[PDB]
Design a protein around this ligand. Structure first.
Ligand code: CU
Ligand code: ZN
Length: 153
């Protein structure tokens, strides 16, 4: 219903618990979470396509894409869909997240369970670098930790 969780983890010590609450069917999805064990400062953060998390987040795909849009974030509109941009981490390597998005829904029609977030090392460039990985991921970093959105209720 309203709630889902994503256990971000990888090989690295970076692990995080994301939480989703949709307080309605068409209302925004309040995302909040804590990632623990990355470097400080801005970390690119977005939704990827994977779902077949059979063994682990090996071949986590590019950013989930509805039709065709480049990469972006909270500057451009030519953002894939799951492009949140980037989030700040404290010096201990703890990134807090607490915001509300209108671009997805875990309740109602599309019920976006399963989806694989990936947390990146460096800040999302907003795909301004002007190379494939800028336009694909915003040159954000080689997929530090990731998981899948599991229904909570
Ligand atoms: Cu990403
Ligand atoms: Zn993107």
């Amino acid at each position: 219903a309203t709630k889902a969780v994503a256990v971000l983890k990888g090989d690295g010590p970076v692990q995080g618990i994301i939480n989703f609450e949709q307080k309605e069917s068409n209302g925004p999805v309040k995302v909040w979470g804590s990632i623990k064990g990355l470097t400080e400062g801005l970390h690119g953060f977005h939704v990827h396509e994977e779902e077949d998390n059979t063994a682990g987040c090996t071949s986590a795909g590019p950013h989930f894409n509805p039709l065709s849009r480049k990469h972006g974030g909270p500057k451009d509109e030519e953002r894939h869909v799951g492009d949140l941009g980037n989030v700040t981490a404290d010096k201990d390597g703890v990134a807090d997240v607490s915001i509300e998005d209108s671009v997805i829904s875990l309740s109602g029609d599309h019920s976006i369970i399963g989806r694989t977030l990936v947390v990146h090392e460096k800040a999302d460039d907003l795909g301004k670098g002007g190379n494939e990985e800028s336009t694909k991921t915003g040159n954000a970093g080689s997929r530090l930790a990731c998981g899948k959105i599991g229904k909570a209720q």
